[PDB]
Amino acid sequence: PAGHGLRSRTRDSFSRAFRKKGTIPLSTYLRIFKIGDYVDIKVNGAIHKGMPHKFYHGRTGRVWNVTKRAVGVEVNKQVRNKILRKRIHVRIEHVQLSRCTEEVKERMKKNDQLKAEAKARGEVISTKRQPVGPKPGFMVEGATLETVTPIPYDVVNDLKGGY
Amino acid sequence: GIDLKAGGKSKKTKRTAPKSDDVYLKLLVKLYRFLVRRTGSKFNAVILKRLFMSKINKPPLSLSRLISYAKGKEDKVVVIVGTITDDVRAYEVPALKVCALRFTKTARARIEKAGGECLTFDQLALRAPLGQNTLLLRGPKNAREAVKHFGPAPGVPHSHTKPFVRSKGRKFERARGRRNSRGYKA
Amino acid sequence: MKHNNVIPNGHFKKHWQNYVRTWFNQPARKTRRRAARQQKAVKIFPRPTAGSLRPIVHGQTLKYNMKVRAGRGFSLEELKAAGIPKKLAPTIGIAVDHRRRNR
Amino acid sequence: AKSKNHTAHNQSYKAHRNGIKKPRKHRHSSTKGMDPKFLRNQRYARKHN
Amino acid sequence: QTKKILQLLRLRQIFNGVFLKVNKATVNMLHRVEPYVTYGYPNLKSIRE
Amino acid sequence: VNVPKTKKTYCKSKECKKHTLHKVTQYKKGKDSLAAQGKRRYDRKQSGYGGQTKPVFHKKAKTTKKIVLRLQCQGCKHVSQHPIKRCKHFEIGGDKKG
RNA sequence: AGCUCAACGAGAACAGAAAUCUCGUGUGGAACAGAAGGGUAAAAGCUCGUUUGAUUCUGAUUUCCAGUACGAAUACGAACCGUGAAAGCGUGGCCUAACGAUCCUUUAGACCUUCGGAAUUCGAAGCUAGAGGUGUCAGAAAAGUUACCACAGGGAUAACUGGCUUGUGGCAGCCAAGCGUUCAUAGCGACGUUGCUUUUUGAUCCUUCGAUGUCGGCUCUUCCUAUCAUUGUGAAGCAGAAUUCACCAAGUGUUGGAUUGUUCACCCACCAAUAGGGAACGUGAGCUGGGUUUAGACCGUCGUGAGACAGGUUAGUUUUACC
RNA sequence: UAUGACUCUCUUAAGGUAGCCAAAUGCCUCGUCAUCUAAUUAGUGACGCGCAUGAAUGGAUUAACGAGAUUCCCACUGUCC
RNA sequence: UAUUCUCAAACUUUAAAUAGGUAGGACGGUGCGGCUGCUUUGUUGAGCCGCACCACGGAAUCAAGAGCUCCAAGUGGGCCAUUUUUGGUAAGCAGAACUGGCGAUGCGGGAUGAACCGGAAGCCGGGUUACGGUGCCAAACUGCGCGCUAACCUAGAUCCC
RNA sequence: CCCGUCUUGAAACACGGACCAAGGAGUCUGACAUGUGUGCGAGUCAACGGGCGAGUAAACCCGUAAGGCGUAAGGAAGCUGAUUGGUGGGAUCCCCCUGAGGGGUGCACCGCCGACCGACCUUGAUCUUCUGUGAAGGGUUCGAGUGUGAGCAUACCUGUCG
RNA sequence: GGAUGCGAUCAUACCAGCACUAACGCACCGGAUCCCAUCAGAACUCCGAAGUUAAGCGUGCUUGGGCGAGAGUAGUACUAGGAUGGGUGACCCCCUGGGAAGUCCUCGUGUUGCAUCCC
Ligand SMILES: [K+]
Ligand SMILES: [K+]
Ligand SMILES: [K+]
Ligand SMILES: [K+]
Ligand SMILES: [K+]
Ligand SMILES: [K+]
Ligand SMILES: [K+]
Ligand SMILES: [K+]
Ligand SMILES: [K+]
Ligand SMILES: [K+]
Ligand SMILES: [K+]
Ligand SMILES: [K+]
Ligand SMILES: [K+]
Ligand SMILES: [K+]
Ligand SMILES: [K+]
Ligand SMILES: [K+]
Ligand SMILES: [K+]
Ligand SMILES: [K+]
Ligand SMILES: [Mg+2]
Ligand SMILES: [Mg+2]
Ligand SMILES: [Mg+2]
Ligand SMILES: [Mg+2]
Ligand SMILES: [Mg+2]
Ligand SMILES: [Mg+2]
Ligand SMILES: [Mg+2]
Ligand SMILES: [Mg+2]
Ligand SMILES: [Mg+2]
Ligand SMILES: [Mg+2]
Ligand SMILES: [Mg+2]
Ligand SMILES: [Mg+2]
Ligand SMILES: [Mg+2]
Ligand SMILES: [Mg+2]
Ligand SMILES: [Mg+2]
Ligand SMILES: [Mg+2]
Ligand SMILES: [Zn+2]
């Protein structure tokens, strides 16, 4: 409304991938969704029911409800000077389980194991990971050196493959 | 130039003294300023901060609610920075040690008859200088008529804010925007 | 009009400034009524200053039927039962009401 | 007399004066809009706990 | 972005200086404000003085 | 549009509370009564001097009306009303498409 | 549930480019109401069978967005149903547009509420849900004219100058196919292409609406050159005469008349020549007032009319300096 | 050749008759022809599918008259040289 | 049939840079027991609730602190600039995107100027700079060096200009 | 560079202003609302009026079942009318030990979910004046409600409106 | 090492042309009384086991097409930030960073879960 339809400017967003149209694989319907799971919203152009508005396409949210055919997704949306946690319902065909927290549980388990070992041996350690820092000095074996010099200019080589 | 907000100065305002001209309240403020400075007690600091507050920020506490909160702690001195009012819905009054800025006549009579005492804050300083064995209580701050009108506007969805109306009845703001049969509801 | 305020309905669209009644004469009216009362008492001495006797009547409607107040005057049936002639009752300080019915 | 039609100039600055504020997420979120049958069963389970 | 990065580096005035540990995150932050600052490897004499 | 003479549809009468057969007719607005309070008020306002006292709509824009179907349940004889989308030609029980 | 479309290839009497039929290939190149974009192949397309989920009840959410309403749409819940063997699907149209408040009227629903002294019955008034419409579509009930005119304002906005620009106008350049008895360049310059100017007209609306006197002519001064004549020169398809091209060059001059208010134009005549322009489209407290542009009046066309006209016509106040 | 005395038709009842005209009425337009001048977008006479003339919304003419609008000639002159 | 020149805002297999979303614990994990009218062939699951144990704070930097509420003013003509960009021959034209600036703001420089460069400011002393400059006007060299130019057209002389 | 003003932009060829003195423009009143000060408090308000009294327009005193506001709400109406909570954070205080610790305490406020009252729907043993009552059991519905009161009076600034 | 039934991924799996396959299977295949179905027992449905591996399914080959990966295109095109940078302009160099896509060339032509069966 108000000058723009619901699916305005969705020619590319809602179209299906090249040579990837037709029937939907059964893996889409064989997925399990639970409250608190992070999901990515990817509109399937062939499923016209439970279609989220184009804004939510390409955004990640958390599951807050589970119905027979759809899931409730809570997505952050910026409106002027604040963030609104908008709750929508989206059919499972338009959603995919997110990998934004795949390593979190693994990292927590390893941190707990390391802390337990440190306590066992009577030491205090920090399990925080660190950004890549400067490398130490090292020795490089001398080898044959190839000399690089600027190339003399030739106008005939200005075109790809030559004029 | 320096990249600071308002030259690094604060933009929050808080009370640093009572706005009242009550000389007794001023004396209490002096007493608790000294106590806060020379004891560093959290109870004393809270009392001093509350002594500055306005009337609506020092709501009264009903006698029945005071009894309910003091149940199981009758040996401690209950302290409220505010007024204590009587409740005709409370039947049994136990012996209580109560400190407040003011007591209503009925509440004071009932406490004294039940066998408690009504104390001022100077007496509280004499008895528990660091607020030991005290029960610090506050009245219901948001339980007033003006608060009902605050919050989301009455006309927006999911809003239960009270509207401002000169009279109550069928003809006073009930037809359009309040019913499905007259335009829209809410 | 602006903000969340009660809808105003002030009735001040006529020449209301020409119909304002002030009360700067309230003490003077009190004094005048007291003087009139004193003069009447002096005139009717030794008759009681409270006036003629009045009957006891019930309040009207369901809101006040439990209340007792003073009526205008005693009914003819009440006067007959008490043995006081209706033509004599007013002359001896008894108010008479020929309209009130006794139910 | 024609005038300007529209522009977003200064709007981001206005928003950032006090925003962008993230509402505080509480531990327990509202159950409004969830599956009514599931909510009914949860209420009965809580009552019989 | 430049102003925010300079605040995070604690450089609010012209000719203010600060030490910074070398990290991938810090280096990438500094790369954004390169035109507004000059930096290098301080000497022991420089740090002491 | 063409609608059938009869329709199997829900009836919320206490007698049925289920799907039942319904006879289909077209609703028609009834005659205005002089005893209606609005009409009485309008006549009182119009009486005397002052000419026309209420608006008279002139800027007609619609070229169609919303056709309302009266569905009378054959079990309890009670009537339900169902609007349909705007149309220029309406008929009930017309010949089926070939 | 069954089937597969457009198109093409090879075949069959009339029959051929195009009728119907057979086989093979056929990723949609067809169809799906409409604009376009998406989407669909044992289907969302075509054929057939059974049907009315285009049904009832309210709430939640999305889009618009103030996170209001309406429209539209989506996912559940509570019923009754259609189809299928069943899972399942169905809350109108494959999705993205196709629509409407208050007041009033009218219809549907209840062994519903009220008519206030008490009963019955008509009548009226209430509650819930639709319908009659506002297309200026968040929704007054609405014909002109004014040159007889008025007010509050606007340089937020036209009608001059000035400013930006230069399409258009005007004035130059470059290349060289050709013209020029032969010879591209004495003199020209097609097809192309680069510029300059603000004496054209446009484009814009920056200044001026508590006002910068709005055409033209007359008078008077000065300035420019893109030079008409005059001084000195080069070139020629320069024998002479005459003419043409070009270079220094703005010192001097560039006129008398008929018609028209005219700028402009066109003729007559003279002359060495009768060049082009600026200076608030120079110049109204310097004039004039013929024209445009108030009020009177006539004609033609238009309008029922009041009146209008980029059409014509006649009469119509030009103020003040002593700062 | 051109036009159409003549015949038939359409809108809407009829289809500009007698007259008059580049008019105080014609855009094109400073229309075309003759005349007036050395030269005339002026004047006069003539022509007329006349943008858009026309019959008491009166057409055509007209002696005499006019502080009415126009063109030319004689006389006259400081309007001008 | 195999090649070939040149193309697309309303074409496209492929496909950047910049920008957009989510997450990186104390609101966590593990092991037992319990509740249900929901769910399952199945105390099978789904949520929730009790007890026990562990949990060095779980990337960097910063954090002149964080959250919440009430009443209310003015404003709702904008304009300019790098880059992206539409109509237009173009415009000191007209219209959009991000950011900044002027408006509301002085100060040094660009001779002069709302927007350019520098830089933002309580009243003063000292020191040093930014942009820009050092022949005079006018504070600072006719400073130390290398080449080019000779303008008989007013040679030429500093982003916006 | 001349102030004031409107303006994107003023020293402006934008308007007002020859000069001086005095006068000269957000006030009073009514209805609300937030905030703050003061009194009392499930109440509060004597100034309609009455009794008096600075020989007195003041001050003082007076509320009988008076009245206003509040103390109960939901329904158009008939009419019905609050079974008295739980939980996660959380200030203060008390213990053990000196860890960003553990236990008890858990006001204000916020988040979440029950229960109760009423409109609507649904439900129905027993009684009953036969149309009422209500053992049990409810609901994606609705409310400017309840779950141990917070108002009343008065003063001032600010804001909307006549 | 396979086949069959049900699948996951949905071309490294597809398309075209050639060659091959023990056993169980899968098929082709024989009929139309019944259920069922059409113009047509072609298809679908039902009842069978005479015959065949001819076809289907499966496997292998093609200096095959397609498809997938790599190299290269190429630090090229493009692009974020800077400049009182060059240039009359059009455009462009440089500084701090990111960084594609045809042609050409090389390689490869499926991997797998559950259950039954043959070897
Ligand atoms: K308000
Ligand atoms: K009337
Ligand atoms: K449908
Ligand atoms: K409108
Ligand atoms: K009028
Ligand atoms: K030009
Ligand atoms: K102008
Ligand atoms: K003007
Ligand atoms: K002249
Ligand atoms: K005259
Ligand atoms: K006719
Ligand atoms: K006549
Ligand atoms: K005359
Ligand atoms: K406003
Ligand atoms: K002004
Ligand atoms: K002025
Ligand atoms: K009272
Ligand atoms: K009701
Ligand atoms: Mg009449
Ligand atoms: Mg099908
Ligand atoms: Mg309607
Ligand atoms: Mg009605
Ligand atoms: Mg030659
Ligand atoms: Mg010259
Ligand atoms: Mg000259
Ligand atoms: Mg006429
Ligand atoms: Mg004729
Ligand atoms: Mg005549
Ligand atoms: Mg973008
Ligand atoms: Mg700068
Ligand atoms: Mg200094
Ligand atoms: Mg009372
Ligand atoms: Mg074979
Ligand atoms: Mg190949
Ligand atoms: Zn029925």
From TrEMBL, chain A:
Query: What is the name of the gene encoding this protein?
Result: LOC107763612
| UniProt similarity note | Belongs to the eukaryotic ribosomal protein eL21 family.
Recorded GO CC terms? cytosolic large ribosomal subunit
Per the record, the domain of life is: Eukaryota
The UniProt entry, under PANTHER family, shows: 60S RIBOSOMAL PROTEIN L21
- Which segments of the protein form a coiled coil according to its record? none
- Report what the protein is called: 60S ribosomal protein L21-1-like
Example GO biological process term? translation
Q: Which Pfam families match?
A: Ribosomal_L21e
Q: What is the lineage of its organism?
A: Eukaryota, Viridiplantae, Streptophyta, Embryophyta, Tracheophyta
User: Is this entry keyworded Ribosomal protein?
Assistant: yes
Q: Which UniProt keywords apply?
A: Ribonucleoprotein, Ribosomal protein
Molecular function in Gene Ontology = structural constituent of ribosome
Automatic annotation (TrEMBL), chain D:
Q: Which domain of life is it from?
A: Eukaryota
Q: Output one GO MF annotation.
A: structural constituent of ribosome
UniProt keywords, alphabetically: Ribonucleoprotein, Ribosomal protein
Spans annotated as Disordered: 1-49
**Key word Aminoacyl-tRNA synthetase present:** no
Biased-composition ranges for Basic residues? Answer: 14-30
Cite a single GO BP annotation: cytoplasmic translation
GO CC aspect terms: cytosolic large ribosomal subunit
Record bears the keyword Ribosomal protein: yes
Q: Which family does it belong to?
A: Belongs to the eukaryotic ribosomal protein eL29 family.
Protein name as catalogued? 60S ribosomal protein L29
Automatic annotation (TrEMBL), chain E:
Can you tell me which family this protein belongs to?
Belongs to the universal ribosomal protein uL30 family.
The protein's organism comes out as Nicotiana tabacum
User: What is the protein name given in its UniProt record?
Assistant: 60S ribosomal protein L7-4
Q: Which gene encodes it?
A: LOC107794124
TrEMBL record, chain F:
Database matches in Gene3D superfamilies: 3.10.450.80
Q: Does the keyword Amino-acid biosynthesis apply?
A: no
Record keyword Thylakoid present = no
- Annotated region described as Disordered, given as residue ranges: 27-57
Which keywords annotate this record? Metal-binding, Ribonucleoprotein, Ribosomal protein, Zinc
Q: Which GO terms describe its cellular component?
A: cytosolic large ribosomal subunit
Question: Which Pfam family, any one, appears in the UniProt record?
Answer: Ribosomal_L44
Q: Which residues cross the membrane?
A: none
Sorted alphabetically, which PROSITE patterns does this protein's record hold?
RIBOSOMAL_L44E
Annotated InterPro entries: Ribosomal_eL44 (IPR000552), Ribosomal_LSU_eL42 (IPR053708), Ribosomal_zn-bd (IPR011332)
Residues annotated to bind Zn(2+):
11, 16, 73, 76
Q: Which GO terms describe its biological process?
A: cytoplasmic translation
MF (Gene Ontology)? structural constituent of ribosome
Which family would the database say this protein is a member of?
Belongs to the eukaryotic ribosomal protein eL42 family.
Query: How is this protein named in the record?
Result: 60S ribosomal protein L44
